Amino acid sequence: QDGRNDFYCWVCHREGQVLCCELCPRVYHAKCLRLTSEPEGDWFCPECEKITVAECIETQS
């Protein structure tokens, strides 16, 4: 019911030490991402945060 955060990290294709992302693949690695902090709730892996800071790369109208 917790969304089974355990599954497989695409970087290693193996399960173990993985965090749940809400804006990306239900499960992802924190080690491969080299994360030293453990956030709770909807966390954004550097991958989602990186594109979030760039915001709309193209100008609208």
Partner: peptide, 11 residues
């Protein structure tokens, strides 16, 4: 559940 991930409680 178990210690699947690190939970050192930053707080």
């Amino acid at each position: 559940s178990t210690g699947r991930v690190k939970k050192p409680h930053r707080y």
